[PDB]
């Protein structure tokens, strides 16, 4: 339905064929479907209608919490505990959001593999490539930090990688 964003959770246009009977025999599946409909789906729908009638009477909402952007750990001087505290809390919240991004991408991948049936190896390549890009980025940022991770250790990992990349590019320029 419209409850969730179809841009973050997309799906193809859902092509389904029309029934083309070839025999005089009655299809027991469709009769069972009519029986199921008129014994199960209608009482359940009525119950839900009443429940939502009672819901509409008392309507209240909640709001997603928004967080400002505070200075990160790079612009905190070495022993300033308050800047360090706020930077570390911000880094932790960002780590949580990145975990959820990888989760969304993995959900897409799984849904594609199930949906595409026998053709998943070709029809889910974009989902696989998207996951590969996200996984590579997430791995660079947080892998090998260990328990007792922190923004300072993430910064040290990034700086080590940046040094290696700079030196590699410099010796490639001499080639």
């Amino acid at each position: 339905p419209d409850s969730w964003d179809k841009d973050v959770y997309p799906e193809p246009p859902r092509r389904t064929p029309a029934p083309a009977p070839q025999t005089s025999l009655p299809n027991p599946v469709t009769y069972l479907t009519k029986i199921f409909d008129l014994l199960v789906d209608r009482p359940v729908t009525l119950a839900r209608e009443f429940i939502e009638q009672q819901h509409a009477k008392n309507r209240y909402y909640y709001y997603h919490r928004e967080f400002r952007r505070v200075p990160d750990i790079t612009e905190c001087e070495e022993k300033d505990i308050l800047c360090m505290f706020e930077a570390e809390m911000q880094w932790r919240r960002d780590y949580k959001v990145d975990q959820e991004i990888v989760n969304i991408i993995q959900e897409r991948l799984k849904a594609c593999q199930q949906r595409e049936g026998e053709s998943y190896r070709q029809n889910c390549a974009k989902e696989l490539e998207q996951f590969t890009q996200v996984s590579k980025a997430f791995q660079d940022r947080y892998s090998d930090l260990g328990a007792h991770y922190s923004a300072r250790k993430c910064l040290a990992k990034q700086k080590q990688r940046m040094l290696a990349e700079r030196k590699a590019a410099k010796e490639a320029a001499a080639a």
Partner: protein
Amino acid sequence: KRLFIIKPSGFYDRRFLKLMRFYILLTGIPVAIGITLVNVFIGEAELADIPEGYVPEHWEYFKHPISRW
């Protein structure tokens, strides 16, 4: 012909099970009925934007009424 079956006493285990069921249900049937009545009549809140210049209370960031309370 009907013979006597020598068993250990089953009175005490049965009494314990009845007492445990009784107390668990005594307080857990009202809770089930209360959660049902809340879910049906009160319900969860719907996500909305924060109106202009408004600042919500800390409990107004959760959707379930019981969690909010």
